Amino acid sequence: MRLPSADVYRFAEPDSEENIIFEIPIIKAGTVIKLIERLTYHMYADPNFVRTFLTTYRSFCKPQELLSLIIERFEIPEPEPTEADRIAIENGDQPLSAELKRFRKEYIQPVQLRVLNVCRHWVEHHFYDFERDAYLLQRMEEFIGTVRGKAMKKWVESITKIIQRKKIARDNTFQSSPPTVEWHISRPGHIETFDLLTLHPIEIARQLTLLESDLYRAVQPSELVGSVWTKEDKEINSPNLLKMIRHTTNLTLWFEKCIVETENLEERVAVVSRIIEILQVFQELNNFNGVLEVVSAMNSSPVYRLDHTFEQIPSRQKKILEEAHELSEDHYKKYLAKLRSINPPCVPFFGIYLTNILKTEEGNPEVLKRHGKELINFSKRRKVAEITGEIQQYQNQPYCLRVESDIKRFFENLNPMGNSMEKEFTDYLFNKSLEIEPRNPKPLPRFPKKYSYPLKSPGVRPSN
Ligand SMILES: Cc1c([C@@H](C)Nc2nnc(C)c3ccc(N4CCNCC4)cc23)cccc1C(F)(F)F
């Protein structure tokens, strides 16, 4: 086929070593024009490239620029009519349009259907681009609303149904019987007495797992691309990832706060022993994020140095805490090995993936140069997308655990730092640790009790 000239169309230039590199062919690098062309190739459908592109394109192209590029890709100019056909059109007769029909059937219609397929995948899996930019959605609805054609009528309707469902879903069922909600000292409804030791450790780990599962499942892969969660626009590009990270920081600091602010040695042992029991139920539910929240708390500077406290921790709980720490040893080797074999539901730990993504961002160049021509390094984005795909494969499996609205709201409003900054609070926790257990030369003072309720744990065995 005779593709349109370059003076009227920019997506028909032949491939060369200066505009696209390969590795269905796998694209390695290329210009933004060559990526849009291969994103909507007329010879075959490329679902893997479409999924990887729309997840990672924001690291090299703005959403407004992408919509303009795919609209320009859509409006393919038709060739000039032949002389014999133009005089039939002048007389009001129907032209032959032999080559014109073959060009529409073999190029224009296949490309235009690929552009619409990209538009459907965009609004279906990355609709947040249109929530953050209303004008982007106005352009998208304006574009698909003015598409004329019979073969494209079904595509316009499907994209419309998805856009409408996304707007309606913005306002807001077990397969098995969930276990019974466990309670300890705090009776149901008495939200004034909810605390670490008053609530049941089984239900503390259950509700935290339900809370952390939802926070994990709301994280989209694009929030982990281009290190956007560490830039100025982190609040706009990674709101769910930051909500997941800030929750992990709040819960970790709360565990440390419950330990160092318990000045009595006997009560502090019961506090640490209860948190280890909470970690044990985290392992049962395969909530690996909750497991390492306890590991990070026990390894922090104020808590790890409490030799007098951990001396009274029973040996069965020491081994449970040891096996939980070994998940982080050797670049989280054992954590990946356990997660890869565990069946969902589960809550992954984001730390190692963010670490391996950042090493890919820093270890690979943004652009590749060929004959002095900068090309978007797309294999770099594909490698980052593969990592986000490993975390995302558990995004859809729910837990078979009943939500307790009072307990869930208690952990959502945990503010251990109160109104002070983190550096001031972390320095306060360490100075509090030196107070409850001074260093080697200084003696160990006694402190009065602060809890008036029994310190005995009800256990981690579900009472059925
Ligand atoms: C198991 C455990 C733990 C766990 C949570 N901590 C650890 N576990 N294993 C090993 C082999 C560790 C090796 C180094 C290491 N870090 C601490 C932070 N500074 C850098 C070195 C912490 C380890 C903490 C506290 C107490 C206990 C107890 F044995 F008492 F239960």
Residue numbers in the entry: 567 to 589, 598 to 746, 753 to 1044
From the paper:
SOS1 is one of the major guanine nucleotide exchange factors that regulates the ability of KRAS to cycle through its “on” and “off” states. Additionally, functional genomic screens have identified that several cancer cell lines addicted to KRAS signaling are particularly sensitive to genetic perturbation of SOS1.15 Functionally, KRAS mutations lead to a reduction in GTPase activity, resulting in a higher population of GTP-bound KRAS and increased RAS-pathway signaling. GTP-bound KRAS also binds to an allosteric site on SOS1, leading to an increase in SOS1 GEF activity, thereby ensuring a high population of active KRAS.
As expected from our modeling efforts, the phthalazine core makes a π-stacking interaction with His905, and the N–H from the C1-benzyl amine substituent creates a crucial hydrogen bond with Asn879. The chiral α-methyl on the benzylic amine fills a small cavity in the pocket and positions the phenyl group for an edge-to-face interaction with Phe890. The C7-piperazine protrudes out of the binding pocket and into the region where the SOS1:KRAS PPI occurs, driving the disruption of the SOS1:KRAS complex. This is in stark contrast to the previously reported quinazoline-based SOS1 binders that require a methyl group in this position and are unable to utilize this interaction. Further modeling using the co-crystal structure of compound 15 suggested that a small hydrophilic hole existed in the back pocket of the protein and incorporation of more polar substituents on the phenyl ring may be tolerated. X-ray co-crystal structures of these inhibitors reveal a unique salt bridge between the phthalazine core and Glu902 of SOS1 that has not been reported with previous SOS1 binders.
